């Protein structure tokens, strides 16, 4: 009927187009919600149409705009949401193209809302599917340079893998999930390093190298972190160990050269 100014700043506004059924309720944090999303730019250009977008409320799987506006919708409601770029694809834009600082008009139809899964009660197959979904979310956030959101999705991906103390999985499932955990921890290190969270990036790097001691990405990232911290004595053998695996790699050379030149104070 009228525009609701959600955050009190005219940056995230919601207008109900079609209300939900008389008995409908709002979804709560943690619920797996399914929506039909029609995204368009401020000038009216349509971006994409996801007829069955599935995401966990409050987990920031896609964009902040959805996690902030969907809890204000009843299951079965169709609403128009105008959101500023800061709650969307920000000062950088995205892959199915969004211009930098572009305000979005989201036509959302909340379809279903089911209770969130008990991570402790997930099957090996479900655990693989949930962790991979969170990993794919984190990857999408990382490509845009949203390292705070990328780190969160990788953190959720890991939490889903490691909460298996009460379910009996096969050896093949445990091994598959270990391979996924190392990929998520390396991805987390890539994200932490971009946020200068050196102590955290180091932990993630060291955990990856405990499973895979010849992981070139984890070696280079540990070396780059130790170099940016000023631990040149510890960084040079690690950066050399990574060059030993790929001697022609220009990025590892450029990193070593930068480190040795700076090691002159």
């Amino acid at each position: 009927e009228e525009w609701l100014d959600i955050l009190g700043n005219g940056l995230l506004r919601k207008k109900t187009l079609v209300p939900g059924p008389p008995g409908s309720s709002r979804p709560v944090k943690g619920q797996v919600v399914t929506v039909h999303l029609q995204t368009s730019l401020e000038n009216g250009t349509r971006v994409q149409e996801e007829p069955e977008l599935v995401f966990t409320l409050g987990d920031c799987d896609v964009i902040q705009a959805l996690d902030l506006s969907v809890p204000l919708m009843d299951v079965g409601e169709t609403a128009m949401v105008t959101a500023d770029s800061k709650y969307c694809y920000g000062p950088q834009g995205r892959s199915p193209y969004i211009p930098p600082h572009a305000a979005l008009c989201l036509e959302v139809t909340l379809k279903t809302a089911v209770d969130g899964p008990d991570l402790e009660m997930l099957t090996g197959q479900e655990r693989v599917a949930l962790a991979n979904r969170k990993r794919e979310c984190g990857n999408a956030h990382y490509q845009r340079a949203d390292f705070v959101l990328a780190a969160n999705s990788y953190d959720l991906a890991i939490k889903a893998i490691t909460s298996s103390a009460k379910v009996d999985m096969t050896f093949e499932e445990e091994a598959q999930l270990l391979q996924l955990k190392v990929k998520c921890l390396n991805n987390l290190a890539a994200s932490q390093l971009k946020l200068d969270h050196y102590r955290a990036a180091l932990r993630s790097c060291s955990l990856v190298l405990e499973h895979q001691p010849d992981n070139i990405k984890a070696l280079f990232r540990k070396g780059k972190v130790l170099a940016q911290q000023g631990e040149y004595s510890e960084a040079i053998p690690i950066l050399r160990a990574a060059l030993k695996l790929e001697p022609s790699n220009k990025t590892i050379h450029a990193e070593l050269s930068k480190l040795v030149k700076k090691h002159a104070a």
Partner: peptide, 8 residues
């Protein structure tokens, strides 16, 4: 050959 900065 390996792109550092790329995520897996």
């Amino acid at each position: 050959d390996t792109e550092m900065e790329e995520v897996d």
